[PDB]
Amino acid sequence: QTADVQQKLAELERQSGGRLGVALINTADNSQILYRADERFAMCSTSKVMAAAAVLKKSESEPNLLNQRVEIKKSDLVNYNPIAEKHVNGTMSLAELSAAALQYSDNVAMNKLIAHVGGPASVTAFARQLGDETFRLDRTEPTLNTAIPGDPRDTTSPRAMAQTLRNLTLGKALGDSQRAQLVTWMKGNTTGAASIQAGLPASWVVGDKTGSGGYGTTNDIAVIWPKDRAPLILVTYFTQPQPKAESRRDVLASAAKIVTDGL
Ligand SMILES: *[B@@]1([O])O[C]([C]C([O])=O)C2=[C][C]=[C][C]=C21
Numbered sequence: 495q496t497a498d499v500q501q502k503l504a505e506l507e508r509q510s511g512g513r514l515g516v517a518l519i520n521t522a523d524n525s526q527i528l529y530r531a532d533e534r535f536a537m538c539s540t541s542k543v544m545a546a547a548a549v550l551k552k553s554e555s556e557p558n559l560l561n562q563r564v565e566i567k568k569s570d571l572v573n574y575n576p577i578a579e580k581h582v583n584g585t586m587s588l589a590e591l592s593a594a595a596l597q598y599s600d601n602v603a604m605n606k607l608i609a610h611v612g613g614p615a616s617v618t619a620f621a622r623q624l625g626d627e628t629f630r631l632d633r634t635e636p637t638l639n640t641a642i643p644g645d646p647r648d649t650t651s652p653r654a655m656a657q658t659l660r661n662l663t664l665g666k667a668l669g670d671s672q673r674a675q676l677v678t679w680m681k682g683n684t685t686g687a688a689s690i691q692a693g694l695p696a697s698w699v700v701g702d703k704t705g706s707g708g709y710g711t712t713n714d715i716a717v718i719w720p721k722d723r724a725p726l727i728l729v730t731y732f733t734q735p736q737p738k739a740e741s742r743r744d745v746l747a748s749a750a751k752i753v754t755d756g757l
Pocket residue numbers: 538539540573574599601636639685704705706707713
């Protein structure tokens with residue numbers, strides 16, 4: 495069964511033409527399915543989870559933080575800001591920016607989360623404090639998505655991100671209020687229907703965060719509640735050889751189906 499899954503993932507990777515990274519943690523039996531799980535991949539917008547979590551951690555000692563008002567200026571706009579562009583010259587709260595970053599992948603929102611915890615090195619130090627040595631957020635939006643092969647900036651490994659996502663969503667990295675808030679935000683994601691969700695039965699409940707970037711980089715990280723089962727954590731990262739390659743969300747869906755068949 496395990497050899498079969500490995501063969502199927504290798505065949506999927508070969509067909510895709512790119513480089514595939516998978517880590518599944520099954521909390522029913524504390525098992526894992528790993529494929530290139532210690533290699534680095536550009537996170538792209540999947541890094542928005544760590545930034546939102548760092549804001550939530552800060553809020554544990556700062557009860558006015560989520561309500562804090564943040565001005566949205568023309569000079570804050572970057573390349574993709576579906577929510578923030580509606581609020582130029584007004585303010586949004588940090589809770590609203592967290593939701594926009596997580597549920598729409600809004601880049602202004604991500605930059606405000608980064609800024610309000612101290613910058614990329616502070617988001618990285620938060621990961622370190624959780625026991626994640628691998629995660630590195632080097633840059634802000636939009637440059638963190640370049641995803642150049644061989645470039646370690648703005649990368650993590652599938653294993654590291656799966657273990658950290660377990661801690662954030664199912665474990666004790668965050669206090670109960672803050673963990674529940676992260677889970678609710680991720681369950682409300684609007685961007686993930688073509689990725690991991692597309693490879694799972696319709697009845698399963700998912701909280702996920704997608705990402706895309708240069709070199710056809712196509713990513714998704716998820717917490718999954720299968721029908722009447724203990725939850726799963728799944729990271730699917732994918733990147734391609736050509737600078738202008740198009741996204742391959744089908745590859746993420748295929749990987750999700752391969753690693754969950756039988757559950
Ligand atoms: B970030 O990688 O996530 C979205 C795309 C997605 O949801 O997969 C996006 C869009 C534009 C810039 C950065 C990102």
